Amino acid sequence: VEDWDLVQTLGGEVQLAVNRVTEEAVAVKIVDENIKKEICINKMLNHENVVKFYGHRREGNIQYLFLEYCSGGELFDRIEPDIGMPEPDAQRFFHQLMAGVVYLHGIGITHRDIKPENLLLDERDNLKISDFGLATVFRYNNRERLLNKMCGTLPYVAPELLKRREFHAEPVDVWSCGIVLTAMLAGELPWDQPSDSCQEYSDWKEKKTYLNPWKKIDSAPLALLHKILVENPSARITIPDIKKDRWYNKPL
Ligand SMILES: c1ccc2c(-c3cnc4cnc(-c5cn[nH]c5)cn34)c[nH]c2c1
Numbered sequence: 001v002e003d004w005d006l007v008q009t010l011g012g013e014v015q016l017a018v019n020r021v022t023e024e025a026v027a028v029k030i031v032d033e034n035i036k037k038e039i040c041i042n043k044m045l046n047h048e049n050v051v052k053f054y055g056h057r058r059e060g061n062i063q064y065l066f067l068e069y070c071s072g073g074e075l076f077d078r079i080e081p082d083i084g085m086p087e088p089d090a091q092r093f094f095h096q097l098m099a100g101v102v103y104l105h106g107i108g109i110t111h112r113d114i115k116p117e118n119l120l121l122d123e124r125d126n127l128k129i130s131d132f133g134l135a136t137v138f139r140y141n142n143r144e145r146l147l148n149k150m151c152g153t154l155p156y157v158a159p160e161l162l163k164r165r166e167f168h169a170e171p172v173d174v175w176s177c178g179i180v181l182t183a184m185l186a187g188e189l190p191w192d193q194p195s196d197s198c199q200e201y202s203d204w205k206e207k208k209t210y211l212n213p214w215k216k217i218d219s220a221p222l223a224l225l226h227k228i229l230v231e232n233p234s235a236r237i238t239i240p241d242i243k244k245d246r247w248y249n250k251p252l
Helices: 034-044 087-106 159-163 169-186 199-206 219-228 239-244
Strands: 013-018 025-031 053-059 062-068 119-121 127-129
Touching: 034 053, 034 062, 087 127, 087 169, 087 239, 159 169, 169 219, 169 239, 219 239
Parallel strands: none
Antiparallel strands: 013 025, 025 062, 053 062, 119 127
């Protein structure tokens, strides 16, 4: 209830804010129904690996979202093109990515748009999941509801979403996570989209892993990926299973 400076715009606009009395820094979203849902979902969320939502003020027609500030920037910038990043660094971001994702699912919320751009790093380099503008509720009162709407980024998106009227929410999220894993370890994205028309996707389906980006990826990491980027969302590895994966538990 005290003045905030509005020092700079981080990323509708997002501008970093610092308190005059305390000097605490906050990320404030400036928005000039989707907004209402975003706030509604944020109220729900409390986790170390999910961005913290402080509050909202309705001013004029402008909506204010008070969110945790990540000095780290986005994970997107920690990947060198065509190289990615050290395997130890990737595993840790992935462990954190899984933690944030697991929490949302128990909570019954799916992000629906997981990408490096949406994964933020704090001062300690800890991963945070950012932006619930596309997020939705997939479990209420212990009953699941199938999703039929299409949203996300095409490279990150699951194959089922493209070819099916209705799909499970959780499996779509795991696929996006796997793709993020691929980028961290390869520095490049496998296909423009997960389609038979796309040549790169077909090769992966054919198992031609002697080609980029698979060639860059180590065999242990790759084995996990084979399990994650499985076209049948029903046969796709689950998060509990990811934890049991050998690479996932490999000391690096
Ligand atoms: C450098 C440093 C911080 C950020 C951010 C940033 C830092 N903290 C937040 C919090 N929320 C957002 C955000 C929320 N919705 N859309 C973006 C972006 N942040 C985005 N891009 C950056 C580049």
